[PDB]
Amino acid sequence: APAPFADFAPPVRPQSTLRRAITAAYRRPETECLPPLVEAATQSKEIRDAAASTARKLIEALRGKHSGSGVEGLVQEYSLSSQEGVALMCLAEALLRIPDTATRDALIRDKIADGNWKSHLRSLFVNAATWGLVVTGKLTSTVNDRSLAAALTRLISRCGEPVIRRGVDMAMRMMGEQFVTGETIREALKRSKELEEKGFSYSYDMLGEAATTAADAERYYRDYESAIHAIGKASAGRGIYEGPGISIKLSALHPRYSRAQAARVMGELLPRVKALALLAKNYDIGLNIDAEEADRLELSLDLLEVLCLDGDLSGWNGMGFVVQAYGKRCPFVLDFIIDLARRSGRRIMVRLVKGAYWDAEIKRAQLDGLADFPVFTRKIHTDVSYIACAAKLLAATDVVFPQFATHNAQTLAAIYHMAGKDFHVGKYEFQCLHGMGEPLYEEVVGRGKLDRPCRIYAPVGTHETLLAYLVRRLLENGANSSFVHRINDPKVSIDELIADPVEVVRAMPVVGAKHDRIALPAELFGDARTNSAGLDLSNEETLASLTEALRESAAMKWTALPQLATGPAAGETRTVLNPGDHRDVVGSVTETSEEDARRAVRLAADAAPDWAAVPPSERAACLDRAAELMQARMPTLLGLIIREAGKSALNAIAEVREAIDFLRYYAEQTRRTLGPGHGPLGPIVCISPWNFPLAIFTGQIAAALVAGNPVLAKPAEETPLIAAEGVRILREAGIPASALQLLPGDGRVGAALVAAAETAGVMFTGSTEVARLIQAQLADRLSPAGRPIPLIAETGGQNAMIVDSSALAEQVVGDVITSAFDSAGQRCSALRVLCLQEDVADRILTMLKGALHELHIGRTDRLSVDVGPVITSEAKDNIEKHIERMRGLGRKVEQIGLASETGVGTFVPPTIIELEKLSDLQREVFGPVLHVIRYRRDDLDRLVDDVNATGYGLTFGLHTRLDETIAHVTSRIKAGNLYINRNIIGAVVGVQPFGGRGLSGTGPKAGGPLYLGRLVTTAPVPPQHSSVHTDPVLLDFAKWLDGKGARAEAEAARNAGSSSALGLDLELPGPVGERNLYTLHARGRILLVPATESGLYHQLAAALATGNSVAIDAASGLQASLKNLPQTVGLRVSWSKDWAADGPFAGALVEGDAERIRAVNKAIAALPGPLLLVQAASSGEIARNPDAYCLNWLVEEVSASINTAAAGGNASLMAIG
Ligand SMILES: Cc1cc2nc3c(=O)[nH]c(=O)nc-3n(C[C@H](O)[C@H](O)[C@H](O)COP(=O)(O)OP(=O)(O)OC[C@H]3O[C@@H](n4cnc5c(N)ncnc54)[C@H](O)[C@@H]3O)c2cc1C
Ligand SMILES: NC(=O)c1ccc[n+]([C@@H]2O[C@H](COP(=O)([O-])OP(=O)(O)OC[C@H]3O[C@@H](n4cnc5c(N)ncnc54)[C@H](O)[C@@H]3O)[C@@H](O)[C@H]2O)c1
Ligand SMILES: O=C(O)[C@@H]1CCCS1
Ligand SMILES: [Mg+2]
Structure with a gap:
């Protein structure tokens, strides 16, 4: 067998000094990154004044020719609302999907204009978020298609065929000439002649990225190959500086372009890039590798290295490579590239950009709980980074060809003066995006302007293909912090536009401070608790340290033993084998006898007062200490989870993070709620599944412990070792051995614990069928007070x-x-x-x-x-x-x-x-x-x-x-x-x-x-748990009670209506680019088993106040107590003589003495289908205790998580600069 972790994540190549300096900067604190960039970007007073003067002249020319847009003119001519403008462009998009021009015009003239567009035209509005950016400048993640449909009907019925014609012509122009240079490479080349005669050059982008399948990657390859031929034929020997080039994305050329698949990348992707580069060499055109997500940067350097050292490509200087100045590694990446250019003798074309994926990098780092961001969080920091890196590139023009891609006139002016008066074509160039930067660079290119060249990045593709790139551009054009948005803002002065970011950053109190409104991943939850931390499996330092820790974890002799309050117990011992390779023995487990399991419950009961007496704040402190210990031990815990449970490294990281988060969350909820009157249930049996063998295990036990209950922990028979380690950590954190006993074994051990007379509560996570067996066991039992033993049973899905x-x-x-x-x-x-x-x-x-x-x-x-x-x-x-x-x-x-x-x-x-x-x-x-x-x-x-x-x-x-x-x-x-x-x-x-x-x-x-x-006998009020809404059927029932003379019950009904949290609707703090919602709904139909009229009225009030319908036991004989109900209430009330025929129910309320409760509990457990959360009370308890039936368990919680970045960007962060 292969040794465990012997080949976990070996790097592509040994990391050089220069490569290690890149990795060291990956998530360097922002306050450390900025000072050296400020030093490197500093220019003399004379140059700063000259640059500000040049920038002002450029900005005055831009604002002086700035005309209204075609869409804005269309909105004006026909007095369109924003929704009408969006709806019109969606219609035009769909009409342009009809190829035959005469067929389209017939549909418009005879069908669309005449009325029902619905009858003739997949929602029309699928791309309305994109058109929304075009029309309004704002990004909405989802489409209000009912609003857009109404707007389209309104505008067509008001304005007719002329507005439709104008919309079609506008959309045809934007999609054929503005968003792309051409639909095909031949069309784009034909359209490039006009500006090449003026001194511009081109780099064509065959729109394509993020291959999902091998066929996708093959398609993008032959697209690039066919474009290289067309561009090379057109270049006709003009060479790499004057003539056109191509840009490619590595993610287009392999469906698994990632560090985790580095071996496949070097074996399968690299030869494809080499083949394209050989063709570019033969035509002598540029071939640029675009930069993508931060976790692909260093991987791409391994491809750049091999290509520049490959003798088959020698003699050609057209290989190009993008570096993103919004990234903290940028100057160190440039040091590496400049050295590679020296070693290889290739004059690498280096395109310096700011960066295109900013919103997504913020979200990703937050989701993954990493130490910091790989990009800056203040826009001005990216500007200083860009100028600092431009200074480095301008000192190395003998070795590399710098390409300064920017639409920012201040950035451009700073570099133009930094570069000085000696210039020749081939020394450096500027770059811009098609349909964005030509107004600026027509003030730069040409002997009559600044006499510096500009290469236009020219997208090429059909309407369909233009998707992702377009939203990235429109986000760019619309962000409050973007130059091209601020140049159009009349509230922004030219003096504000020409402000020198270098001097502004230097003058700030804390140079390089993180943005005030962006939370570090550790701080997502603010003062409530500390977020768990993950690990970056794209970081070579992390992979190297993790490899060592994982190998060391595999050498340990892991065991799991029956850990009773009195010490470890003897039992039957067997090995635990790796599910992925049964030759790999992970450890040994000693399983618990049924006698020792019963003994453990008795020890738990004897120790219950001593644990309940530990104040809640100190119990929570144990949980917080356990969380710190698990965080510190994460690499070793990863290795055990990987080998015992068959988990990947990424999944094991998530598992340990979840365990840490449970500990810290239940600790904080305890500090918010638990007081002297929230008494523990007593010994709680925690039975857990194999598939989340640390997280769910820890969550159940941590909750029971912090609520003041001693715990019998029965882990799944498949995964005892990580459970034993979690118990060891909790005990190290201060949980006494009498409060937390570990009982390894199979379902026999779980059943023996459930059945033990002193067991006061059961927390089960596992299969529905086992939960049903536990439900049957517990229906035999009552507490010493004569009430059902609480069961939390979290079971399977069919999702x-x-x-x-x-x-x-x-x-x-x-x-x-x-x-x-x-x-x-x-x-x-x-x-x-x-x-x-x-x-x-x-x-x-x-x-x-x-x-x-x-x-x-x-x-x-x-x-x-x-x-x-x-x-x-x-x-x-x-x-x-x-x-x-x-x-x-x-x-x-x-x-x-x-x-x-x-x-x-x-x-x-x-x-x-x-x-x-x-x-x-x-x-x-x-x-x-x-x-x-x-x-x-x-x-x-x-x-x-x-x-x-x-x-x-x-x-x-x-x-x-x-x-x-x-x-x-x-x-x-x-x-x-x-x-x-x-x-x-x-x-x-x-x-x-x-x-x-x-x-x-x-x-x-x-x-x-x-x-x-x-997990306590009297539930506290949870944080934020209330609702101002009152169920209207409850209100009708309370009025009916008063009309019947049942004045005390009517008052109790009104009180239940107020106390109910039905209708609670909260947004929970979390990562950017997501909305996480939490709501309380009705459970459904509650089975009511009353004994007395007043008991029935109380049960009905509790169920109605929480939005439920009811089925009332007909054998109660209480039908005459509910005569002449309001129709609203009657709609919610049914009577059941055969409970199994009238389900499924969503819960139950029972009234009776102890043996009546026990009998009803058995009958309820025999019902087919779901386990029912049953609450029981005696008639006297209903009279004495207004909370005899707790409304917490009569509502249903719903969580909803909405990815608000799905449309291609983050609207909230567009205002964060
Ligand atoms: C020809 C060309 C090629 C390009 N190729 C690539 C490429 O291969 N890969 C790639 O990722 N980008 C690339 N870009 C850059 C990207 O597409 C944008 O055009 C560029 O970032 C905009 O910068 P600017 O100087 O035009 O405008 P500015 O308004 O000066 O700068 C905007 C930029 O600031 C950054 N930013 C915004 N807010 C913040 C913040 N709160 N904190 C830190 N930084 C912030 C972002 O990078 C944003 O794009 C290219 C750009 C051009 C013109
Ligand atoms: N709803 C949730 O949050 C959640 C989470 C994880 C897993 N699950 C469910 O858990 C199942 C997978 O985990 P599993 O295979 O370990 O479940 P399982 O039902 O086979 O076993 C779960 C635990 O019950 C114990 N057990 C088995 N028979 C018992 C008995 N007769 N009496 C008392 N205890 C008994 C087992 O030893 C184990 O500790 C899946 O159905 C999955 O959907 C649910
Ligand atoms: O959004 C994009 O595709 C970036 C900008 C130009 C090439 S990389
Ligand atoms: Mg099982």
Whole structure:
């Protein structure tokens, strides 16, 4: 067997001194980056004055020829509102999808103008967010398609064919001549002659990036190759400076362009770039490598190095490379490139830009919990960085060819004067973007201006292809901080535009301070708690240190023992094997006898007073100390999780982060809530699943402990070692051994603990079928006070994602691959059923299957592994039996081929199964098996019914740009965690409180504010837990009670209406570019089992105040107590003689003495389907205690996470500069 982690993440090449200086700056604090840049960018007073004078002259010329835009003139002529202008351009876009010009004009004249555009023309408004930027300058992430439809009807009925004609002509010009230089490379070359005669040059961009499949990458390759021929033929020997060149993106040329797949990149991507470069060499044209995301920078340097040292490319100086001045590594990258140019003798063309992905870099660093950003956070810092790096490049013009890409007249003027009076073509150049920079550079190019050349970056492509690049440009043009936006702002003076960023930064009190309004990832939650920290698996220093820590973790002799209050106990011992390779022994577990499990509960009960007496603040301090210990131990914990549970490094990082976040969140919630009157339940049994073997394990135990309960921790039999280490950490943090006992073993140990007389509460996460067995055990039992033993049972899912024809296929496929196959589908949240609108299903399926075949399955101690094993041979057999049954029914089955190395472990290949109906699924299949169904748009409401009809309700995803569809689907779906335009596996503690309904859970949600209150006898009021809304049926019921003379019950009903938090609607703090919402809804239909009239009235008031309907036990004989109900109340009331026929219920309220409660609890447990959260009270308790039935457990929590950056950028951060 290969030694564990012996090949985890070896670098492409040994890191030179220059390469290590780059990596060292990756996330350097901003206050350290700026001082050396300020020093390097300093120019003399005489030059600063001359540059300000040049910049003013350029800006005065720009403002003096600035004319109104074509769209603005169109809006003016026809008095359009903003929505009308957007709707008009969407219509024009759709009309231009009709090729035959005469056919289009016939449709306009005889159909569109005459009225119902709906009857003749995929939503018309799929790209309205883009047109919104064009019309209004603002980015909206989703489209209000009902507003746009109304606006289009209004404008057509008001203005007729003439406005439609003007819109079509405007859109045809912008999409054919402004957003691109041409539709094809031949068209773009024909249009370039005019400005080349004026002294400009060109670099053509065949719009293309982020290949998803091998076929995508092949298509982009032959596009680049065909463009090089056309450009080279046109260049006709003009050479690399006067003649045109090409720009490429490495992400276009391989579907797995990432550091994790570096070996594939060097083996498969590099030869393709070399082949393109050889053709560019033969024509003697430039070939530029564009810069992309920050985690691709250093990888791209390995390709640049090999290409510049390759003798087959010698004699050609056209290789070019972009460096992004908004990045903290920029000057060190330039040092590396300048040295590479010296070593190779290649005069590398270096394009200095600021950078195009700023919003996304802020979001990514926050999501990943990294130390700092890889980009600056103040715009002026990027400006100083640019000028500092320009000074470095201008000192090296013998060795490199600097290309200064900017539309900022202040930046340009500073460099023009920095470069001085000696110039020749080939020394350096400026660059600009087509349709953006020509007004500025027509004041620069030419003997009559500044006599410096400019190369125009010219996008080339069809209307369809122009997508992502266009929104990046329009974001750029619209950002409050952008020069091209400020030049048009009449409130911004020329003196403000020519302000010298170098001197402004120098004069600030704290030079280089982070932006005040952008939180470091550690500070996402402010004073509430410290965010967990992750690890950057693109950082070579991190990979090197992690490799050592992982190897060291694999040499440790991990054990798990029955850790009773009195010390470790003896038992049956066996080895724990790596699921990816059974030859790899990870450790040993000693399992707990049923006798010792019962003994542990008795020890827990004897120790309960001593732990309850530890004040809540000190219990929370133990949790916070445990979190610090797990954070410090993360690399070792990663290694154990990788080998014991079959997790990849990325997934193990997320797992340890979640454990840290649980500890800190429950600690803070404790400090916000728990006081002397919130008494503990007593010994709590925590039974946890194998698949999140540290995070869910820790979360349940931490919550029970901090609420003052001693815990019996029973980890899954598959994953005892990481559980034992978590208990060791909690004990080191100060949790006494009597308060936290570890009982390894199988379900027999869990059952023995559940059944023990002193067990006062059970926290279960696992399969629905096991939860039902525990529900049956507990229905036999009552507390010493005669009440049900509280059970939190968080169970399985049958999770769907709905995708309509407005979604972006590339986004969908990435989120589907992650949601369905991450962790080999062994997430309770994993995507099980993908629902594709019929019109786009074939294209998305083709793309999905292509992405599937790029996944690497194997033992997870290699960074290049995407999908690990399933946990056991029994799990594998159960999953494969499902796949074969489906294959036997003739369903299409797509499967990855598995390498021979997988035979030593238990692997199932990622699988796509195309189904005909959702009813083709019976139970959760906990493996890498995605089911695909198709639907017609008009059947969307029925499809949501079908998703709800499974009885599950855990996670749910929707990909759409259309507000009407978002409103429709999210109001009708019944699931606990919703996700819009993102993956569906998010469970960030305190951000997406996690947990579902129906067959998926009882609640309350883990990682949410109602959780701790379930673990004490009297629940506290959670932070922010209130609602000003009163249920109207409750109000009608209270009036009916008063009319019947039941004055005390009517008062209790009004009080319940006020106390209810139904209607709570909050936004939770989290990362930028996401909205995370938390809401309280009705649970559904509550089963009422009353004994007395007053008890019935109290039960009904509690259920109605929380928005529920009820089914009342007809055997109570209390029908005559509810005569003459208002129709509003009657609609919510039914009577049930056969409870099993009238479900599923969403909870129950029971009145009676102890043996009546026990009898009813058994009858409720026998009902088919979901576990019911039952609350019971005696008649006397209802009389004495207004909170006899707690309203916390009669509402349902819903979490919704919306990716607001999905349209291609972040509107909120556009105002942050
Ligand atoms: C010809 C050409 C080629 C280009 N090629 C690439 C490329 O391959 N890869 C790439 O990533 N970019 C590239 N760019 C740059 C990018 O597309 C933008 O055009 C450029 O960043 C805008 O800078 P500016 O000097 O025109 O305008 P300015 O208004 O002076 O500067 C705007 C820039 O400031 C930065 N910024 C904004 N807010 C903040 C903030 N709060 N904190 C820190 N920085 C901030 C951003 O980089 C933003 O784009 C290219 C640009 C041109 C003209
Ligand atoms: N809703 C959530 O938040 C969530 C999270 C993770 C996993 N899950 C669900 O958990 C399942 C996968 O985890 P698993 O395979 O470890 O679940 P499982 O039901 O097989 O076992 C979970 C735990 O119950 C114990 N157990 C088994 N039989 C028992 C019995 N008769 N009495 C008492 N305890 C018994 C097991 O030993 C284990 O500790 C999946 O169905 C998944 O959907 C849900
Ligand atoms: O948005 C983009 O594509 C960047 C700007 C020009 C090339 S890289
Ligand atoms: Mg099991």
